[PDB]
C-alpha cells in the first residue's frame, strides 16, 4: 500500500489544462515515474512524479483542493 | 482590520500572536512542520498547514512554503514573530510583492538597520549616541586597524555586521591576536550569515544592558515605552530582563526616550522594535537595534497596560497610534525568566517528553509557554519552552513573587535551567539592583 | 480538551492572487 | 510585621492566603483535616499540623483544634479567609482572648454586622439607605405584618437573620402562605444555622446586584474600592462576578464609596469588609454586609492593583493605611468566572480524581485554585475547585479573554462546570451587560 | 499490630507531672483500661487510654514533641 505524498504546499488538479483529460484515473496503472498529479503554488505549475511502478489502488483528493507537504496524494499498490 | 493573517512561528510566541489575533477577532492561519504538529497553538489554531519537514531549513525559513500557505489559507497578513524571518527583509519584500501585509517595518528598514554598520551611522545622523569604534567596515590595512584601536584604546571586540544571538563575536586585547581573531570571526560569519564583513568597536567592561521599546505607526508619530534591564546574561544570551530599568531617573528616561522617538521618525520606522543601549556613568550608547517584537517584551505590557502585539497588529492594519506619549504610564515593576530546556550544568539542550508539568499561578504571575503534560520536546528548534513574567507595586515584591512561582513550577522528563533561575532570585546583588552585563558568568565563574 | 483536535481540512473556496510576473 | 500565622481554611484562599505571607516574609502554619494531606497549600506550607477527620465539623469547624494547632507552632495571628469561621463572633473573641490576632473584625463588629436587623438598623442610623422592610424582627402580630406587607407592596421575601450561602430563603407573593412560609424557614433555620430568627424584607424583582469593598484599619481610616455587579447567579449564588459594575457613573461610585467609608469609621470597622446592595432606577438599598474577604475580590485586587489580602495582613499588624482616598484608581476592567466540580446539568457535586489538568493562561489572565493532575477531590467539602480572572482595558477585551482562557481550561476525571461558564460568556445579553440577577435562571427557560 | 494515635492536637507528656513516674514503658504490658500518655492542650493535661490488652512494643514519640491529631504514638501487639 504505498503512498505518495505531495511535495509542496499547494492546490491539487488532476487535469494539466481546465478542459482536459485526466492524468490517470483510479484502475489504470502507471509506471516507475510519470506525471500523476500536478500541484499549483504561486502559479509554476508544478508535477508530481511516481517514485514506484505500480498499479493505482485510489486518489485520496479532489481536484481543486488545497494540500499540505506530506499530504497523501494516491494510493499504488 | 486584518481578515485573516499566518503566524510564520512556533512555539511561546506563536500561542502570544494566536492570543491576540483570536481577541482582536482575527482568524489565524498556523503554519507547522511534520514535527510540530502537536504544538499548544497548531492544537488551538483555526487553519494549520503543514508546510515542510523537520529541520528549519525546509520548513519555517522556507519563505515559498509560507506564502503558499498564505495562499491557499486566502490570508492577507504574515506575522513573523521573532526569529527565523522576523529580521530578514528578503521576506519582507517577498512578502510585500505577493500583496500580502508584512506585520513589521519596511524591507528597506529591515536592510538599513539590518547591518549595524549602517544602523550605527544612522544613528549618529540623527543624534542617538554610539559606541565608539571602528566607524566601518575592517579592512586588510593592518596599518590603520592598530591605529583605529589605539585611538579607541583597547581592549576591543570585532563584531560581525550580521551577527546575532550572541554568536560572531570575538574579544581583543591586544595586537598580537588581531588577526587571527578578525579571521576567525570572518570564518564563522561566513558558516553563520553568509556575510564575512566585521567591526570593531571599543569594549566596556561595567556597562548595563538598557533598551527601548518604541511603537511607530509609520505616518510621523512614534512613541517609547518605558525601558528594560536585560544584564543578566551568559554568553551574550539574555536569562532575566526586567523593566523599569533599576536606577534610570525619570529624567534620563525621558531624554533617551524622545531621542529614540525622534531616531524612529527620522527613518519612518513602523511597527514595533527595539533600541539597545549599553548603560554607563549616565550615558547611552547604542549597539544595535531589534526590528521586530523582543523576547522579553511582556516586561514592558505588564508595567504600561500596552499590549505589544496587538499594537503591531493595529499598525499593520493602516490604523494609527491610538496612545499618545503622555497617556504612557510606568506603574510597577515586572521581572522575567527564560525557562530554558537544557542541562543546567552544561547549557546543552535536552529535549524529551514531559511527564509532569504544573504551571505557577497567582496574583501578577504570568506564564508564556507552549508545553504540557505529555508534550515532547523536538530537537530541531531552540531550546526555550516558555517564559515567567512576575509584576509587583516594586521590585522587591516582583523578586518575591518570582522567587515563589518558581518553586510551584513542576516540569520533569527534561532537563531545564529552573534551578539556575531559582538561584539567580536568590542571589543578593541582583535583589540590590544594577548589576552588569558580565555578572552572571562572575558568579558561575566557569 | 483540544489536545486530541479533529485535525480538519482546508476549505478551498478560500482565494488569493499572486502577480504573474 | 506578623511573626507567623495560621491559615484555618482549604483550597484556592489557603492558597491566595499561602502566597500572601510568602510575599511579606511571614511564617505560614496550614492546619488541615486528615482528608487534606495533598492539598496545595498544605504541601507549600512551612508547618503542616492535622486538626481532625475528614467532617468539616470536626477539623475545620473545631476552633479549640485550630487554637490549639496556633499554641503548639508559636503562631501571633490566626486568618480564616471566607466560609467556615470567617464570620463567627465566637471564634473572633475567642482567638483574641487566647493570645492570637484574629485578622479581621472585632467580635463585637462581627456581632454586629451578621444581625442583619441590628444591620440595617445600623446602616438607617449611618445614612446608608435600605430596602423596606419589617424593620425588625417578625413578632406573632399577623395583623401589624400584613399591614406592613401591604404598605410596602407585595411580593415580600422571609430571610432568616443568621441565614448564608443564599439558604434559608423564601418569597412569599400575597398574605395566604405567609405564615406557613415563616413557620417553614424558621425550622429550616433552626435545622441549619441553629437560630430562627427572621426577618420580611421587600422583594425587588429586576435589582442589579452590586457591592462595595472597604478597607478599614480601625484607627478611624476607611476606603473605598470601586465596585463589583455579581448580578449573574443561581440558586442565590454567584457564578460570574465583574468589576467595576457597568453603567454606575463615577459620581454614584463615589456616592454610595463616601457613604459607606463613613459608616465603617462610625461602627468602629476593622480589616476588610463589603458592603452589598440592590442597584435599581439610579438608588442603591442595602441587604447586607460581609464581614470577611470575598470570594470574588480577586477582580476589585485586578482593577485597582490593591493586594486585599496583604492590606489585611498589614491592618492586623497594626499599621495604619498607607492608601489615600484619591490614591485609588480603576484602570481596565475584570470578569471572574467560578469553576466548580459538578454536573453542569444536575448541578450535583461530583468529586473524584482529576486525571489531567492544563491551566490557562496568557496576558491578563490569572488562574487561581488548588488542583493538580492526580489531585482526589474529596466528598465533604463545598464544590468550588478554583476561580479564573481575566482583565482588560475594557469590558469586551476582558469577556474576549475570559472566552479564550475558558476554551484553554483542561479539566477531567471530574464534571466541572465549564460548558456552563462558556454559554454564559456566549450569551448576547451579557455581553451587552446590565443583566438583573434572575437573569441566569430565566436562560435556563424552566 | 494495633496502634493507638492521639485524638486532639497539643504537647505530648509521658510523666504526669514534671518530676513522677512515667504511665508506662516499654516492655510491661497494658489492659484496655489504663492511661498511657498525657496530651496537653490549653493547660489541660488529658490522659489517653488503650483499646487492646498487649504489650507495650515500642513508643514512637518522645517526651515535650508537640503532636497531632490522628498521630501514631504506640503500637500494642
Ligand atoms: N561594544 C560593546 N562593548 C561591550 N560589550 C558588547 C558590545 N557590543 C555588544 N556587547 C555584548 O554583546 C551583547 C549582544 O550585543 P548585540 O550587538 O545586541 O548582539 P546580538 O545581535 O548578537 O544580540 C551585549 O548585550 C553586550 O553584552
Ligand atoms: N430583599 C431582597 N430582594 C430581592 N432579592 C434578594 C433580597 N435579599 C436577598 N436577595 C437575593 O438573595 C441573594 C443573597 O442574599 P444575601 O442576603 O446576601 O444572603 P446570603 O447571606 O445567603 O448570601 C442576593 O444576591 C439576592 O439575589
Ligand atoms: C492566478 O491568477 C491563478 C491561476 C490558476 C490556474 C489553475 S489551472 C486549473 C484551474 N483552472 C483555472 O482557470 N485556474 C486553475
Ligand atoms: C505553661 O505555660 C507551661 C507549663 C507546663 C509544663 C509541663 S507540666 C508537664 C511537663 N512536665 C514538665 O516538667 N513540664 C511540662
Ligand atoms: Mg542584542
Ligand atoms: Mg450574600
Redesign the pocket.
Known sequence: GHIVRSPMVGTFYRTPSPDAKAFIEVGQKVNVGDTLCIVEAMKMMNQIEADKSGTVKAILVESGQPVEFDEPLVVIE | MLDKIVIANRGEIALRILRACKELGIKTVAVHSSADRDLKHVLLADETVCIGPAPSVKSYLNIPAIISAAEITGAVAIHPGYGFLSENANFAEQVERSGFIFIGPKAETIRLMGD?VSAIAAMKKAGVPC?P?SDGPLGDDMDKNRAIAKRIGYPV?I?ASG???????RVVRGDAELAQSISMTRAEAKAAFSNDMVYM?????N?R?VEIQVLADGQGNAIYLAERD?SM?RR?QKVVEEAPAPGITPELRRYIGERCAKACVDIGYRGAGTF?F?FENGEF?F??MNTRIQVEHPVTEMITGVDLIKEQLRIAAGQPLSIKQEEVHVRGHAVECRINAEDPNTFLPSPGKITRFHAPGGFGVRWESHIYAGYTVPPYYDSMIGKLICYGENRDVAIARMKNALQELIIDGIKTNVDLQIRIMNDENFQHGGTN?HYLEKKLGL | SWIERIKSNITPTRKASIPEG
Not at chain 2, 568597536?201 to 567592561?205: D, G
Open positions: 549595524k559606541v569604534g571586540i563584531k551577527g546575532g544571538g550572541g554568536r560572531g563575536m568597536e571599543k569594549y566596556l567592561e556597562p544592558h536585560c546574561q551574550h539597545e549599553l550608547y549597539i544595535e552585563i
